Amino acid sequence: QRCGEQGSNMECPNNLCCSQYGYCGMGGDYCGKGCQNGACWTSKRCGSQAGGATCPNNHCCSQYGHCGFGAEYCGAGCQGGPCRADIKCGSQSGGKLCPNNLCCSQWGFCGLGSEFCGGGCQSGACSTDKPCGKDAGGRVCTNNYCCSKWGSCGIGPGYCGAGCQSGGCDA
Amino acid sequence: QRCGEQGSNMECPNNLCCSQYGYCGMGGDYCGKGCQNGACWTSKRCGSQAGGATCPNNHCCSQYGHCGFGAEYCGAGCQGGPCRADIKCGSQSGGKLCPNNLCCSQWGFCGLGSEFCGGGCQSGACSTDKPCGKDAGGRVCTNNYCCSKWGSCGIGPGYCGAGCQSGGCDA
Numbered sequence: 001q002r003c004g005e006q007g008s009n010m011e012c013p014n015n016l017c018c019s020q021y022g023y024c025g026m027g028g029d030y031c032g033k034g035c036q037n038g039a040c041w042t043s044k045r046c047g048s049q050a051g052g053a054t055c056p057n058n059h060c061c062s063q064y065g066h067c068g069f070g071a072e073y074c075g076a077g078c079q080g081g082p083c084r085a086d087i088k089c090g091s092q093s094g095g096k097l098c099p100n101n102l103c104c105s106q107w108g109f110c111g112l113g114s115e116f117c118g119g120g121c122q123s124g125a126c127s128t129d130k131p132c133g134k135d136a137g138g139r140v141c142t143n144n145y146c147c148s149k150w151g152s153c154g155i156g157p158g159y160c161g162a163g164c165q166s167g168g169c170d171a
Numbered sequence: 172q173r174c175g176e177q178g179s180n181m182e183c184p185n186n187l188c189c190s191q192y193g194y195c196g197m198g199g200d201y202c203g204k205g206c207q208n209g210a211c212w213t214s215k216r217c218g219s220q221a222g223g224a225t226c227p228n229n230h231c232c233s234q235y236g237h238c239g240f241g242a243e244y245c246g247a248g249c250q251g252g253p254c255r256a257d258i259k260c261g262s263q264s265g266g267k268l269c270p271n272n273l274c275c276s277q278w279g280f281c282g283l284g285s286e287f288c289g290g291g292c293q294s295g296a297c298s299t300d301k302p303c304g305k306d307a308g309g310r311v312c313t314n315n316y317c318c319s320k321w322g323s324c325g326i327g328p329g330y331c332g333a334g335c336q337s338g339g340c341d342a
Contacts (some may be wrong), residue, residue: 001173001178001179001181002172002181004186006293007178007181007222008172008195009184010173010174010181010182010183010184010195010199011182011183011184012181012227013180013181013182013227014270014271014272015229015271015273015283016272016326017296019255022279023225023327024179024181024327025325025326025327025329026272026324026325026326026327026330027295027300027316027317027319027323027324027325027326027327027329027330028300028323028325029325029327029329030325030327031296031298032227038281039272039273039274039288039295039296041281041288041298043284043285054315055181056184057226057229058229058230058240058253059229059283060184060253062284063298065198065236065288066284067282067283067284068282068283068284068285068286068287069229069253069273069281069282069284069287070258070276070280070282070284070286070287071258071280071282072282072284072286073283073284075280082231082240082245082252082253083238084245084255085249086241086242092211100185100186100199101185101186101187101210102189102210103210104185108239108323109242110239110240110241111211111239111240111241111242111243112186112230112239112241112244113214113233113237113239113240113243113244114237114239114240114266115176115239115241115243116239116240116241117210117212124210125186125188125197125207125210127201127202127212129198129199133229136243138233145197145198148198151322152194152198152199153197153198153235154196154197154198154199154200154201155187155197155198155201156194156195156198156200156201157195157201158196158198158200158265159197159198164212165174169277
């Protein structure tokens with residue numbers, strides 16, 4: 001029920017702005033000064049201009065390193081987000097990972113949905129759920145996902161907790 | 172700290188899937204069966220095919236009414252989300268509202284950022300914060316935003332609560 005730093009980087013639905021207090025709404029109280037994620041009045045910075053920083057709420061990072069939607073942000077020069085041009089990844093691009101957990105299709109493009117995440121999926125949010133760890137000739141998860149006690153890739157206490165064979169383990 | 176119905180429709184950062192329990196993570200425990208929002212293994216339905224339903228996490232609604240990213244979802248036939256084609260709105264389009272609170276620029280296109288939300292902004296998440304209510308010759312907020320006791324448009328208890336002059340008031 002909280003957003004931003006008070007809600008573990010949780011984002012509000014329908015681009016609602018997270019105020020400086022960790023609450024979701026609309027108006028100057030949420031979108032103005034201290035706005036956390038969502039349609040903030042003062043767009044957040046990203047890409048090149050702000051250390052590789054990704055846009056929250058899947059916003060496109062325009063060529064000037066600002067976050068938003070529309071031609072100016074998703075069009076030409078777009079550096080991150082659901083940019084209007086296909087984004088390349090995988091073996092075909094020196095094993096690049098897609099940003100924001102997106103799937104890298106068998107063809108080397110970033111997306112979400114069956115075509116990217118289903119069979120052939122290279123990295124990211126693949127729905128193929130391939131075996132990792134010792135029961136898997138010690139193969140490791142992509143994206144530094146945790147390889148659970150069970151030989152499954154994921155993120156969460158169950159995956160990164162006790163019995164984590166490799167990846168971004170807590171334990 | 173919760174997502175989905177347990178977190179008031181709050182979404183996880185970086186397309187993490189919200190499990191059926193209202194927790195954010197990655198793996199079959201979160202993205203599989205019961206997945207709430209984020210990179211669910213089974214894309215959610217939208218637009219025409221599912222009553223006008225919008226995609227969570229700003230995903231594009233492909234022409235078949237499925238949610239995702241990439242050419243198949245944001246390209247041709249895209250019905251909602253950060254579609255590759257400019258989305259029209261406003262006076263120029265029989266006063267249509269943009270989906271997901273996006274700003275309708277002075278020119279009749281949907282986006283977020285200064286160009287859409289700044290001066291001339293027609294509807295949505297405008298940063299112009301224009302006066303509503305009685306102190307405003309009884310003008311009303313767009314998007315059914317609440318016109319607060321103060322003559323400000325917004326969403327939240329402060330806006331929709333007591334002294335709400337018009338809009339989607341609770342009080």
